[PDB]
Amino acid sequence: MVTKEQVEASLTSKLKPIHLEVIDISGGCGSSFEVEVVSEQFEGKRLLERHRMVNAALEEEMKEIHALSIKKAQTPQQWKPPSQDSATLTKDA
Template sequence: MGSGVGLKYSRPSRISDLSRFSQRQRVVNERKLRREREREKEKEEEEEMGVTKEQVKSSLTSKLNPAHLEVIDTSGGCGASFAIEIVSEQFEGKRLLERHRLVNSSLEEEMKEIHALSIKKALTPEQWKQQQESQVSKPAA
């Protein structure tokens, strides 16, 4: 009966059994800690992805069909801040605030991750044309 059969999971009775038990426990704890760190790292990487310049362009293009669109990532690549210049026929007859609301609603999903959106220009094609002509006619200083 004293051959140790059935004592595999019992309390360690000798010092050598105690050290093996603590080694095993240490290995298990290290594995758990490693898995937790990997999960945290994956979560951080997902959060860092943010919104891309291409996603912003794609959403605005599909919803507002712009004649001109310039999107600049002003956040340094993390997708938290953008500057936009947009020209669309959908802005005809709308005030500036309504145009900005159209842009913001077009980026509804992206705005959940964007911290700053600067709409530099929201013009109709006619306004854009006039602006381009006036810039060409101005003499260089």
Template sequence: MDENQIRSKLKALDPVHLEIEDFSDGCGKKFKLLVVSDAFDKKPLLERHRMVNTALVEEMPHIHALTMKTLTPEQWKNSKSLDC
């Protein structure tokens, strides 16, 4: 499992920004995601995470740990402005 495989599958969510970090010492089993997409607009957090999990359904058996932050573009813009 590598970042490119995950990136390819998450294109289904049409992200405006996507960060993928492999924190598994190179074995491709643990990932952190930041997914910014209009598809998350008016969706609760649980539904957003389900959308990501659905996009990665074929990869999930190979992933040991997945941490994700799912934001709308507006939320991302506001969170970046707080990072002084």
């Protein structure tokens, strides 16, 4: 059992305030959060180590919550200058 509110500040601390967006898509408060991370732990890194690195700092977190899904493990080098949300077609471009 956890709160997403502490998850908010927790990931920001252990992973650093780069790009974190976790959202309980399971229960209400405590439960399996879907995180979107863009941090330097994915920088020219291999996707597998990418997840294994984020959850390293979030594994303790995962033990207290129901689950933590890193839906996105990306760095500003592939993220590059923002041109992804545009091409989501949520505003055409």
